[PDB]
Structures are given as C-alpha cells and as structure tokens.
C-alpha cells in the first residue's frame, strides 16, 4: 500500500512541478488530488478557438480571470469588485460550456484542477471525505486555484450518508472558517462548475454559485462563427456558401454543427479513397477538395 | 483480498498477451481488461451480414478507417478524426449485435466488450473507478472501440429517482468521453470509439446521444434484404432442387433477421427429424448426407 | 461477512458433486449461489410419460429442443443452423402443465437443469443482480448442455418501462446481452449449447426483445375432450381399481376445467370414500387404516 | 447492524424453543419469518368457539387438517390424497373467517405461521422475494405447517400490467414456490404445506392464485340458527336475568354479521354495569360487587 | 421508554405520556351526552378494570370509536381528554408520519405502532381525519391496519373524520361506536366562550348574547381564535398606550373596548 502510494506521490510530484514551473509538501491525500491538476499546455484550445460565446467569454474574463489573477489592480475598487467564490456554466448539451472550461484552463493560467467524480468517491470509510480537505488545501496552496467539476451532479442534492458526508463537507469547506480570511482575500479559489441539467442541482449550489452563465444554442449568426471556426483546416475553395450552411442549421448545437462539418469534410476524402483504391499504396496528399455534401 | 486480485491480474495479463500480439494496470483497469476480446474469438464478419450494406460502408469509411490507419486522414487536421461514438438502433433481431461482432472481428482496433455487470460495482465509488479504468485502458490500447450493448440500460435519461452510483457512472462516463482531456495536447483527440447498440433510443440520455454523431438505424429487412438473409442463413443446408428461395423471401415479409434465422432453422430441422423418425425402427448410428430436405419448408 | 461465503460454497460444491455422481469447477462468489439452483434429475419425480393431454408439444420439446441441445453429434453436419433453439417459452392459462412440462424436461432431458428462482436474481446491493445474471450464464457455459429455467418469467423480464426501476432494467439488459451478444457464440460458431426455458401465463408482457430470444413459443392450452380423459387416467392411477367407475362421463362433465382443476376434483372424489370410512370407523377405538373404501362419484 | 441480526436470531431461537415442544440453523430471512410462527396456546379460540357455521368447520377438520396432520391414514392413496395445496376463506367482514383461521391455528397443532403484509414488503431491492422464499422454506423445515395470509387480496392481487413491479415480482415468487419445479419430493409426495388465506373479495384475489387455492369456503352472513348460536356463544360470561329470552334478540338482528352481534352484546353487557356505576358515584368506594341485571338492552 | 426497534423509535416521536397531555374534559366543554357516554364506555373499561374482570372479556373496552366531527379544532380534541383522564398513554398518528418514501414502509410503521401500543398496554391510537385507512399502496396499508386491528387487549383507536359514508365497509365493522361531534349550535357556546373566556376577563362582561349569536355557525376553533384575539384586541391598544406613554413598562391593567369580529 505504501509502495503504490509512493508511486502515486512521485507522479503527483512530477505533475505538480510541471504545473508550477509553467518543492511543495503534500499529505498522501492531496498527492492523489494533485494528479488531477491540468497543465496549461495540455489544452489545445484558447479563447480564440471558440465562436458565438463572446459576451459570456468577456464576462468570464472581466469577472473570473482578472479578479482571480492580478488582484492588486482591484484594490482601488474595494472588496465587492472582486471574484466570486464559485461560477456555474449551465445550458443545453453540446452548446460549448466544457469548451469554455477548457479555454479557461488554458488561457487563464492559474492552477486549474478538474475534479472527477471518482476522486471524490472512495471505497474505504472516511477517506472519501479527507479527499475534499485535500482538494481545498491543494487549491489553497496553489493560490490562484480554479476548482472545476464537470457535469456537476456528484455534489448534487440512495443518499448513502458517506456520500452525504462528502457533499456536506464540500458545502462546509466551501464557505466556512476558511472562506472569510482575516487577510482580506478569499484565497482566490473559484470552484467553476458546469451542468446541462440545471434543475436538479437542488438549492445549496444555487446560492453558493453567484454567477451562472447560460450557454445558449448559437442563434442565427453564431452558427456562422462556429462554421468559419471548425472549417479552419479544410480546403473549401471552389464554391462553399457558408451563409447557406449557417442558415440551414436551424437548431443544431455546437457539437452538432461540428459533426456535420466532420461529415462534409469526410465526403471528399471518402469519395477520393473510394476511387483511387486500385494503385496499391494509398497516399492522398492534397488531391481532393471540398465543395458541398453536408 | 490480495489472493483474489493476483489471480485476476494474472488472468487479464494472459488475456492481453493473447490479444496484443501480432503494460502496467491498476486494480480497476485489470477488472475491465477481462473485457478486451480478440478477433479470433468472434466468428462473424462484414461478409456475413446480409441486408444492411449501406451501414457497412458507413462504418468502414467513417468509423473504422478514420479510427484505425489515420495517416490518410492527417491532412485535414483534427476535424477528420473518427467520431466520438456510434449508436446502432432498431427493432430487435435486425443486426445490431451482429454489426458489433463484425466490428470486433473485421477491424483490428482492440475491441473492448463492456458488460453492464462490470460497470456496476457493489462497493461505493468503484463504478466511477471502473469507468475511469475503461477510458484509461481504451487509451492504452490506443485505437480502441468500447462496445456497450443494450446501452439504454446503463446510460439513459437521468432523473431524480435513481441510485446515487448510477448518476455518478453516467456523469463520469460523459466526463471521460467528451471532457477536458478528451483531446491530446497536439489536438488529435483520443482514438477511442464508443459503439453502442439499442432498440430504444428515446430512453438513451440525449446528453449521451450528443456524444454519438453516427447514429445508424438498423431497419426491419425488406423484400430485397430478406433474399440475402435467407442466402446467408442457408449456407450448409443443402437445397432440394425445386427449392424456391424467392417464394420464401416473399412470404417472410414482416420478419426480422432473427425471425428469418429461426424460420430457416425450423425448415432445415424438418428433414433431419424425418431421418430420425425413419431410423426409429433401428439403431441410432452416426449421421450421413442421406437426409435431404423434402422441400422448402416455411 | 465471510462465513456466509464458506457455507454457500460448500453447499454448492456438494450440490455439484451430487449432480456429477448422478452420472471439478472453480466457481466465483456469484455463480457459487446459482450452483445451489442446480437441480438433479433424481429430485423431479415426473416424466414425459407422466404428463397427459398435450402430446404434440412433448414431441416438439423432444425432437427440436432436447435432442439438439443434448446429444448434438447427430446434428454436426447441418452446421450452426441445426443447433438447439436459444429459447423456449411455455405459455397459456394457469394450471395446464407449463411447470409440469418444465419438470418433465428437468427429469428426462439429462441436460443439467438449473431452476432459477426470482430471488437469486434480485440481490440487495448495487450490481449484485447483474453479477448473478452473468453468473447464471457463466455456470450454464461451464456445464454446457444446460437448461436455465425461469418460471413466471413475465415478472422478471417485463416490457422495460421508461421509468420502471434501474436494477430491474439493468438485469433485463444484462440477461439480453448474455443471451446472444458479442460473446454468446463460440470461436468456431456453435451457439453456446444453452437453452433458457421460461414458463408464463401472461405472454404479452415479456417484452418484444425477449420474445425474439425465445424463438420457440409453445401455447399450453386447456384440455379438450380426449385430453381431459387422459389427465383423469393419469391422476387416478393411484386410487383403487374401481367399483364400477365411469370415466367417460367425468371426461365431459369437466367442461372447461384446467389440469389442476381436474386433479383437484379427483382429489375430492378420492377423499370422499376415506371420509366415509373415517365416519363409519369413529365408532371403533383407533383409526388403523386398511383397504375398505371404494370410488364411485365425485361432483 | 450485526447486533440487530443477532438479536433477531436470539428472538427467533427462543420462539422456536417455545413453539417446538408445545436448534434449527437458518438464514436471516428465515430469522425474520421465525418471528411469526405462533404457539397454538397463544390463542384462546377453538373449533367450538366458532358458532354458527359448521359445514366449513367440518370440511377444514376433515379434508385440510386430517390430510395435513395425521397423514398415516391417507398414505395408501398416494400423492392424490395429500393435503390440498391451499385454502381460501371469503365472505363479508365480521362473519368469522379470521377467527375460523384462528381456531385452525389453535386446534390443529400444525406449525401455524401468520404472515403479515409488512413481513413481505421490504425496503431494499430483492428482499420481498428473499422473505417469500424464507417463508416457503421455513414451512418446509416445519413440514406439517400452515401459512396464513390475512387479506390475501392485499399482498396478492390481480397483477395489473402497470403494477409496482416490486410487489408484482414478489407475487410471482409465491406462485413459483407454491406449485413449481421443486414443490414436491423425489419420492413424489407433495410438500404438505397448506396456505390459508382470508379475503372479502375473491374476484380481486387473482386468476392464477385462485387455481391453487382449490378449497374455497364462503363465510356467509349468519341466518337465524347461526345467529342464535353466535348469540349463545357471545353471552357466556354475562349472567342472564330470568325474565328475558334469546329468540327475539336472534330474530330482530338480521343483517348484522358476527362482529356486529359481538358489539351489540358488548353494549348489552356494559349496560348493567353502566347503571350500577352510574348509581354509585356517592355510594362508598367502588371496588367490587356482583349485582347485574342483563335486562333487555337493544 | 424501553427496548424497541428502529420503527418503534420512529413512532416513539409521536407517542406521548398521559400526564404530559394538557387538561382533559376540564379543559373542554359544550357537550354532556357525548362526554358522558364516551367516558362511561371507555375510561371505566380502562381505569379500574378489576370491576370488569368478572365480565369475561365481553364487557371490555371498545376496540375503536369513530367521530363524525364537522371540522372544529381538528374536528375533535376529545382524544387528549380520554388519554389524560384514563392514563391511556396517548400515541398519536398523522398522515404525514404515515406516508412512505420506501417500499413497504407504511406497513412497517403500522406494525410498529400496534406493536408499540402493546408494550404500552393501555393506549389510544388516534387517526386524525381518518381517510388514509379507507379506499395503489394505500390498499396494502388498509389491509395491514385491518389485520393488526383484530387479525389474530386494552387498546382504543379514536377515528376523526368528516364523512361516515367515505369510510370503508370493513372499517365501520371494526369501529362500532359512532359518536357524532357536531358544531355547537345551541346557546351552550356561551359556556364554550365561558371556558374560552376563563383566561382573561374584560372590563365588564358585555352582552353574552352579543358575543354568542355572532358565532352561531362558527366552529369551536373559530370561537377559540376569535376570543384569543378579540380579548387581546384592546390589549393591543394598551400596548400602544405603553409605547405612547414614555416607554413600555410591565403593567397588568387590562382595558377592553369591544372584542368582536
Ligand atoms: N461555441 C463553439 N464554437 C466552436 N465549437 C464548439 C462550440 N461549442 C461546442 N463546440 C464543439 O463541441 C465540441 C465539444 O463540445 P463541449 O464544449 O464538450 O459541449 P458542452 O459544453 O455541452 O460540454 C468541441 O469539439 C467543439 O468543436
Ligand atoms: N443482417 C443480417 N444478416 C444475417 N443474419 C442476421 C442479420 N440480422 C440478424 N441476423 C440473425 O440474428 C441473429 C442475432 O441477431 P442480432 O443481430 O443480435 O439482433 P439485434 O441486432 O437486435 O441484436 C444472428 O444469429 C443472425 O443469424
Ligand atoms: N397435461 C397434464 N397432464 C397431467 N396433469 C396435468 C397436466 N396439466 C396440468 N396438470 C395438473 O396440474 C398440476 C400442476 O400444474 P402446473 O403444471 O404447475 O400448472 P402450470 O403449468 O400452469 O404451472 C399437476 O398436479 C397436474 O396434475
Ligand atoms: N360465528 C361467530 N361466532 C362468534 N364470534 C364471531 C363469529 N363471527 C365473528 N365473530 C366475532 O368477530 C371477530 C372476528 O372477526 P372476523 O370475522 O375474523 O373478521 P374478518 O371476517 O373480517 O376477518 C371475533 O373477535 C368474534 O368476536
Ligand atoms: F458537456 Be456537455 F454539456 F454534455
Ligand atoms: F440485440 Be437485439 F436488439 F435484441
Ligand atoms: F400457475 Be401455473 F405455473 F401457470
Ligand atoms: Mg462536457
Ligand atoms: Mg444487440
Ligand atoms: Mg408454475
Ligand atoms: Mg379479519
């Protein structure tokens, strides 16, 4: 149990060093949560690779990344002009909120850690609750921390009191004897969330998360943005009426437009592979081209 | 407890030594490593499924080719990756699981047959661990394919009335399958396809359906696909000449693939029963090629 | 939480040893209970020569389920199309020989009949029901020429309501998957040599996906005229010879009675003479039975 | 947890010790069902306390008890002269069909277990089936036993399509354990377990349960003679005054069941003591006295 | 107050002792026939049972008495007095504590309360607004209640309702006594108000009919709520006089003007 735990702490040390450098001493519980620490260059997308979400993205910048990173500029404004202690991203599925979380992890650059539901659930008794202490202590040590819970229904409200204990301790250490620091700082740990079913999250997270951003479907020209964005590496040279494709996708979500673009791009490559499958070695270097075929 | 996990680990190590030929695993990746199946096991291939041929070319040119052997599809960037998943749906007995067996056999993509029994663990917080192990083993066996048959049971429309472990399984699955680290640092995301099959897509968790771009309907066989189902089912069954396959294909209209299989079974079982009833007046030695079907029975 | 496992494993090993010596394995914790469901042929005191009435269903079960399943060497020339049918569903009104057909199949087949009860499938903890449904087929495959029996299968394999329950729905899906899924055949193509016999009196409640997997569906009807007289003979084999009994009359007086109703009427008609003897014998000291009574009328 | 199970085990063991002689290893559900095996001396009623109806009270004693207990007289007939599979009492409320089952419990000495509706319905998935198996296995460990379900139409019932499916899945366990595969012995003798059930309605009981309760005795409203006998049995403690009679009371009350006559006689008996205490408030200290009248009180 | 399982513990939060109950018939009024009959038919068969030991189990306490009970103060409050004077160890039961969120939970509660009452040999089960018994899981709890009633003993079940016809036919069989508790429609309400005015007395006592005839159709709880505030109505003026006369001082001088409407 110690040798495997030693491998755990070694991998944690490597990951935390690669995060910090862009040292720390951790107990064996937060050497297991620090494995779920997302390095900055591990994300392929920034705020420029997202389309349609611009007012929400400026909200997340001006209220969640500036109040949480470089807070000295906000000493003039006082205390109310600061970052909340929790933000939520709700809306339909596929609309692009996990992508917002990914862009926040990449561009914000302040100790992002994504909590999976498995790291909160432990078979043994009690130690499934010390991991929440480890999460918050790690977020307090990695000072500009952004805790993230994707599909946030593990802290949703069989009860399984041990799981109830984990949820209650998460609520308590959310805003308890540590969320009101005498140093005039909340420690800058914004527990970002996300969920496509906003109703079932019962009451507590709805009061603990002041900012709640609805990621709608792209209405009438944000789908044009997502089309111009997904089709960034495909040769659409001869005749590709992008406005028609933006107008035909009536109520498709971002993932739906993305998969439609995937099919439309597979179309020329498919109809090329299906035609030159006779010379033996298929290469298919730059020969095909995109026209239509959504 | 170690006396059981050591035997388990030995078993999965032997299974993967059989499969991977032409790797460290934790206590959970092992328990899912018993699900990895080799193409030698499944006997069915794409050349054995009659009728639904339009779905075969779609799986080949849009799932298996983009997933296995991706060097062709590299010029188009991450847009030309394989789909996140596939959902084969239709009435029962039309070829969903048979397509699954063909994908297991005729792909060469480290097929992983995930049972509902293994996702659902008794101890607390082990179902989430089993899902994380499923997606960590599908990532180790890189161009892999996770197959959840009857996927509308494990997944499915979430509600307030459901076991607290099931909601965690669903959320953990969605997180691993279209989450933060579902794309590599270079941008090429995780050549892992979740192939599911169901006969009820209106109970399959639309948030999950968003993850499955390719949703193929396996329709009920028609007059032209039934004459291929009958051909495939009747391989070894030697036909008595004057056997009219067209009449049997036209009389079995409202039947599925399995119903046509069972009809052909009960039609080829007839001459053997005649053979048995005639040899009732003597001993029962080994069989022979004497009994031919008296006619095309239906 | 450990002695129960040792008790159940020793019991299942003893049971399997009994079935084997009627003519070992390493069973895990979950199929170690299903090994208790395995019944021996010497337990079931019923044979196909003991059922009455239905005779073209007995012929069907013998010819196209029992012979393909056990003793398959006669069918190794037709291929996988001559394998045993994956599923037989005996359906019909209550009390007309469904469970008796299952009992005769358990006794006469000699194919490792396993009487699966609805309790062993329904476990308390999360995932144990799925583990039991997997262990059923695992044990049936360890004992290849095997039959799985689920009496009153409609209450266990219902039509999959949209919000019925998760444990029941997962058990249904697990049973469907292990019935004929990815790993249901062999590496060569033999369909696993397992037949799950089900008995129900509500046919249109099983759900369509499951009736697909039981391709042979036998309606067990009510006894007609010649079936009622055969049921009467088979029931009255035990009673006295007769004191001028009339059986053709009783064969038609039982207008729409099922098999169990005919058996109960015969029970009452046989109890009547012993009651007469008890009444006439109370005047004496002790009962001390003999063979005085008769059998004439029961109505 | 473990302490609760051990306490239930100790209670069931003590109840078995008190029931056996006017030791058995058994699982937890049989521990819970063992808390219902009742001693015959725990009940005050007998076959002579049951006024009115006498044909039913003879049919039970002579075709359900003598076949069930004392089987050495019915041995020659074989499995066809065994005890009936089950017994059903039906009739309007208060006509003495639970008191009749109570007398069957007392005056039979046949391991009478009284199964409550709560013992069957459990909170966890798959515990009602465990307890049904427990009751049908404990009745077999107590071979000449009786299983009384009171208000059988509540526990059982015509299983609708859209039923609870946790009370309908237990409703099939009763049928499976009742008359199923292993519901006899290798020698061919039945299981000699008789299940007695009382109900106000038989058309709602079931269609598949009523065929295995072949003995069905209706407990009708008392006529003139039955009502007179019920009156003569209810008035055993009360002291008659030489003035009144019983015929006019037996004739006035017509639609009253057994329990309605019981409550009427209770009022008629409380009337004299009522008057005595009402004329005795400032009459010394009421401690004891015998001066009733039992005059005609409607 | 002894050993008991978790369900008897769940039901123990509603059980109360006799002495802890408020005043009995001395606390209420407005009826004499109903109180007299119920008293001499229940409290006597419970208090001093030695006087009935020669009866022979026939002239014992009734097994349950229903109440027609046009709604006033829960449509009845006689159960409190019956448990208080008889020392009956009043165990209460509500529909809220009778519903179920787990399968087979209401039946467990019913068996616990009846099992519970038996440890407490003298006991008064009380079904306020008894319609959860009559009448698809409620049928099972109905059958359970019927079976625990006499399905196989100094216990009484007080059933308050509002419609005799709505009760099941197998329930009126078990509740023989049908004590009607209608609204007070006579002049006796003044005595009601008398009791309702035994808390505090106004400046003089105004016209008794002036306060009586106004509540000619009001319920008993209606009278109790009117007089609990009408007499307090001018007292609010006295508190306002405290506020206007310097600061509020602890005084004991009542000053009524008119307690009506
Ligand atoms: N606003 C958007 N612009 C561009 N692509 C988007 C957008 N929203 C979603 N997508 C596409 O959806 C895929 C993942 O969607 P995701 O953010 O996981 O949806 P959700 O927010 O429901 O989790 C990405 O590959 C991305 O291409
Ligand atoms: N297109 C098909 N071609 C040949 N056989 C088929 C086809 N569809 C179904 N079958 C028959 O059905 C049986 C299994 O049915 P399956 O494909 O598993 O149904 P489902 O797709 O509903 O799971 C196989 O034995 C096969 O013989
Ligand atoms: N075909 C039959 N021949 C003889 N007896 C029968 C037949 N069908 C039903 N029975 C009688 O029914 C009783 C058991 O019925 P069972 O087979 O359990 O009914 P079901 O098939 O509805 O479960 C037996 O005692 C038997 O005497
Ligand atoms: N024939 C009878 N003789 C004497 N008492 C009777 C008779 N029938 C009913 N009773 C009375 O009714 C009570 C039993 O009611 P019961 O008839 O068992 O209810 P149900 O019929 O609804 O089960 C007994 O306590 C007894 O006093
Ligand atoms: F993350 Be997505 F909203 F399912
Ligand atoms: F697998 Be099939 F749809 F029943
Ligand atoms: F009750 Be039988 F099994 F139809
Ligand atoms: Mg997401
Ligand atoms: Mg399938
Ligand atoms: Mg049966
Ligand atoms: Mg009763």
Author numbering:
A (entry chain B): 44 to 65, 86 to 220, 225 to 361
B (entry chain C): 44 to 65, 87 to 362
C (entry chain D): 42 to 64, 86 to 361
D (entry chain E): 44 to 65, 86 to 361
E (entry chain F): 86 to 220, 228 to 244, 254 to 362
Reproduce text from the manuscript describing this model.
We incubated Δ30-Msp1 with ADP•BeFx, an ATP transition state analog that in ATPases (depending on whether BeFx is bound) can mimic both the ATP and the ADP states, and Δ30-Msp1E214Q with ATP. In the second structure, the Δ30-Msp1 hexamer adopted the same spiral arrangement with the exception of M1, which showed less ordered density, indictive of a continuum of multiple unresolved states in the Msp1 reaction cycle. We fitted M1 into its equilibrium position, in which it closes the seam of the spiral. This structure, henceforth referred to as the ‘closed’ conformation, was based on 48861 particles and resolved to 3.1 Å, approaching 2.5 Å in the stable core. In the open conformation, M1 -M4 were bound to ADP•BeFx (mimicking the ATP state), M5 was bound to ADP, and M6 contained an empty nucleotide-binding pocket. In the closed conformation, each subunit displayed the same nucleotide states, except for M1, for which we could not assign a nucleotide state due to its multiple conformations that resulted in a mostly disordered map. Upon modeling the protein into the density, we observed in all three structures extra density in the central pore of the spiral, spanning its entire depth. This density likely represents an averaged composite of a mixture of peptides from endogenous E. coli proteins that engaged with and became trapped in the central translocation pore. We modeled the putative peptide as poly-alanine with the C-terminus juxtaposed to M1 and its N-terminus to M6.
The AAA protein Msp1 (in yeast; ATAD1 in mammals) extracts the tail-anchored (TA) membrane proteins that have failed to be correctly inserted into the ER membrane. TA proteins that escape this reaction are mistargeted to the mitochondrial outer membrane (MOM), necessitating their removal. This proofreading function is performed by Msp1/ATAD1, which extracts the mistargeted TA proteins from the MOM to facilitate their subsequent proteasomal degradation. Here, we present a collection of three high-resolution Msp1 solution-state structures (an ATP hydrolysis-arrested Msp1 mutant and two conformational states of wildtype Msp1) that address these outstanding questions and begin to explain how particular features, shared by AAAMC proteins adapt it to its particular roles in protein quality control and beyond. To obtain a homogeneous sample suitable for structural studies, we expressed the cytosolic domain of Msp1 lacking its 30 amino acid N-terminal membrane anchor (Δ30-Msp1) from the thermophilic yeast Chaetomium thermophilum.
